[PDB]
Symmetry: C2
Subunit: 140 residues, 2 copies
């Protein structure tokens, strides 16, 4: 009993199921399959976009172990939206939990990584379109 | 080599124009954003590309140019900005060289991207490199007050 253009934030969780598209991932590392999306999205779009890219796939926040392996796949002007996010007074967290160090250049909610960035970085324009960093877990 | 009776009109042709700091002294005392240390600073109302700021600051008022914020000035600049606002700043690498400005000096720049354009934000403590230099933003300009 309502019309569109009205919406509320959708809730997202990490996937519980295991999958990997072994022909299409960007790289694989430590039992996980990583994907840079071919189409570009807004920072929040990445939640649904990664959820729809393949089964058991979600929007991924790079840790200190993973981030360097991610960022060397990038040229000097390329960037990826990453799923590291905050909640209000909170820290930065991801769908896998944990606490992230983020370089807050802007008091915004959207974070990305670059070739040279060592941590996620906050951006002034979250609706700017970029590829998304997604992950799925491989079978064990 | 050059004494042409004719030049072609090639619609989009250009080369980089050179810019220097201004040698004359002026300040628009009604229109500056803030004044500090015998200098007048202007954030431009109209937005430009990073390289556009050279000309834009040059044409805004006489004796005015695109300004690279030093450690002393930067904090005074950045507190005039909200949490998402940003300013293109005239901090640039000249050749293979380190970061400099129209006033000289050597700048520390946080290079998130291997680009040529730098900016400042509310939270930034140094100039920062941007992925898209043609993105439109206000320019940081300066002129030098009398004596």
């Amino acid at each position: 009993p309502t019309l569109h253009t009205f919406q509320v934030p959708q809730n997202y969780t990490k996937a519980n199921c295991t999958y990997c598209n072994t022909r299409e991932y960007t790289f694989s590392y430590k039992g996980c399959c990583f994907y840079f999306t071919k189409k570009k999205h807004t920072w929040n779009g990445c939640f649904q976009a990664c959820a729809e890219l393949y089964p058991c796939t979600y929007f991924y926040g790079p840790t200190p172990d993973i981030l360097p392996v991610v960022t060397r796949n990038l040229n000097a002007i390329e960037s990826l939206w990453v799923g590291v996010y905050r909640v209000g007074e909170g820290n930065w967290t991801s769908l896998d939990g944990g606490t992230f160090k983020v370089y807050q250049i802007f008091g915004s909610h959207c974070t990305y990584v670059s070739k040279f960035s060592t941590v996620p970085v906050s951006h002034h324009e979250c609706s700017f379109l970029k590829p998304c960093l997604c992950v799925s877990q491989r079978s064990n």
